[PDB]
Design a protein around this ligand. Sequence first.
Ligand SMILES: Nc1ccn([C@@H]2O[C@H](COP(=O)(O)OP(=O)(O)O[C@@H]3O[C@H]([C@@H](O)CO)[C@@H](O)[C@H](O)[C@@H]3O)[C@@H](O)[C@H]2O)c(=O)n1
Ligand SMILES: [Zn+2]
Lengths: 437, 262
Amino acid sequence: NNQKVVAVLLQECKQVLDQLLLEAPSEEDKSEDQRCRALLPSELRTLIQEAKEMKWPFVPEKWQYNLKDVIGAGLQQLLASLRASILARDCAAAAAIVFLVDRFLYGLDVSGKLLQVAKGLHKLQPATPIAPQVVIRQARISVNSGKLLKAEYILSSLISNNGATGTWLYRNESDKVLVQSVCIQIRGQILQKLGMWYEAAELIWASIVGYLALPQPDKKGLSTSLGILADIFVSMSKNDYEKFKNNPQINLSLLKEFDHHLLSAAEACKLAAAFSAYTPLFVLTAVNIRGTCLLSYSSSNDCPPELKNLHLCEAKEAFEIGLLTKRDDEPVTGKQELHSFVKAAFGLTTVHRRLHGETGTVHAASQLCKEAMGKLYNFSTSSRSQDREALSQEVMSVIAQVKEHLQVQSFSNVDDRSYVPESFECRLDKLIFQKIL
Amino acid sequence: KEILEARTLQPDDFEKLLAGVRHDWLFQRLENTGVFKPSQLHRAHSALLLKYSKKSELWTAQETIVYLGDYLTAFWVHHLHQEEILGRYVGKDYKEQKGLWHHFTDVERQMTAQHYVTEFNKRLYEQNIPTQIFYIPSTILLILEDKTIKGCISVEPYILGEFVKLSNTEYKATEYGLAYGHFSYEFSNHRDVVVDLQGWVTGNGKGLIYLTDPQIHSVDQKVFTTNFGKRGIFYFFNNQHVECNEICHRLSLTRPSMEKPC
Ligand SMILES: Nc1ccn([C@@H]2O[C@H](COP(=O)(O)OP(=O)(O)O[C@@H]3O[C@H]([C@@H](O)CO)[C@@H](O)[C@H](O)[C@@H]3O)[C@@H](O)[C@H]2O)c(=O)n1
Ligand SMILES: [Zn+2]
């Protein structure tokens, strides 16, 4: 399940497709396909049949209205079944498996090989439906590689055409609106990459409106759009924010309640964390950004002195929330998550330095943060699974020591599954599409 | 020594730097800091991340921790305020240790070029022309030991590519570069022009280009501008970019009216 072996297996699948492209259509092939599609768990088989039936433009997530775990568990078997269905010429099942593994493999940063095998499948049988999610993935990688015009072409095609793509068949209008909202969000990201902060914020607001128009709001999409909007608010100049604040078509509570782009960004981070309350990594990322926004605001000449400490305490809470996303002896595996934990630890230490001077506890926490940083670099440099597990353990031990030193106490949320205080979900309710298109 | 006295930042220094300081304040503040030794690699250090904005013309500091690693086969760096957690970043110190003025000047130059190229790419996108040339962002890390500056490092994202001169997509890299020079002239109210025809080409020669070693001619002289001023400007328009290209026209860039100075 390492990026490299999976990339090699996907290259092998695509080479098998190139081979079949030159040949004519064995019972051994369909026997192998049935065997590989029966070796897998029934949940994965149900997901495969639902994807082949096009019941959704995207694969659902628990808590959107685990998936990552069940996909990562049967990734080897799912790719084996993919290449088996490829030999059998059932391009529909292969496309369904592609749809099922697309998000996870984007996480592994090998979407290119997967899109290659997808285009090979389309070549073998052009009538095979391919999920809007995979086309949007192509647009995403085009954005990431800097082919902004190609990405915009794809996104505007999917938007103007009410989500229509290839031979895909929708089952309701809400799914079309959802696809349109995701595409508008990615267009906002395109403008953000160019630094067109105002227009980017406009498109992100349009995506938020689209998400809220669904019968069940897409909480994951909402968290995403609000995090992007926080980044945009951070990047904006005072004039961009003044202009985006006085726009009548933009009815956002965080705008008419805060008069500074950094405070608005911090509020938007709080909202994004709330919208992903059951996914601790997104909570940690959003609250790290919130603490950074507050550290910058409280240190600026625009912060009334009377309020400085208060905003620092807000930062405090922010970083504390991040540090509370994990417990002692709870394993961390990602490089991004380990980095974010060191970030939160140092942000809390810095808040304590800004509130209390050069105290002994602040100094001890700074030393612990430097030790964790060393371990984190050695983690990002190691290439063995046991070496990286021990390093993650040492980093998280240092993080727990910093939590102890700085006296981080848990919060109690009635929802025992939420990683954010109730003061975030509180704001969630009062956040505020066809005309926008 | 008095150098050690000047290298120590007081709470007031930290407060000013975290709020945002002007060029003149920053340069006068670090006047008697002298020259430092190479930073110690394979190590985590407390540091100040300093970033320069041409829009606001401000230097802003954030407290951070950086780990300095191995030299590139320039050395890998990783701090807590990177734009991209999973991305890779390289830091660089002059082989001959120099003062802080040089680091700050180089960063101001890079970020002025980047401001102009960002506006250039906005205009290009509005006109449906692919974006082809960019400038690597650059930041400063003041490596500190007990609130005392003990090092200064420049930090950039890592780019994998080959150095080229733009000599040899829809337009040649030379056309992008010269059109960008013209754009810098216009957008800057006829007071600046960025001239650079060299950089890192990526993606097997097919991909984007990140320009380096920029030369900024200007009548408003700054620490980072060239020694030529209007001369340079004239030269660019009379020898380098003699006749406009498609990009200049699609941007509605007019020809300057100048006389060979001196
Ligand atoms: N809270 C949150 C979630 C995700 N991200 C980041 O977004 C990008 C892309 O997410 P993805 O899950 O890989 O894209 P999918 O097309 O597979 O899923 C759809 O995602 C959108 C929206 O959340 C993101 O576009 C939803 O509206 C749709 O319903 C689908 O779920 C990831 O890198 C991820 O890290 C994020 O930042 N924050
Ligand atoms: Zn021209």
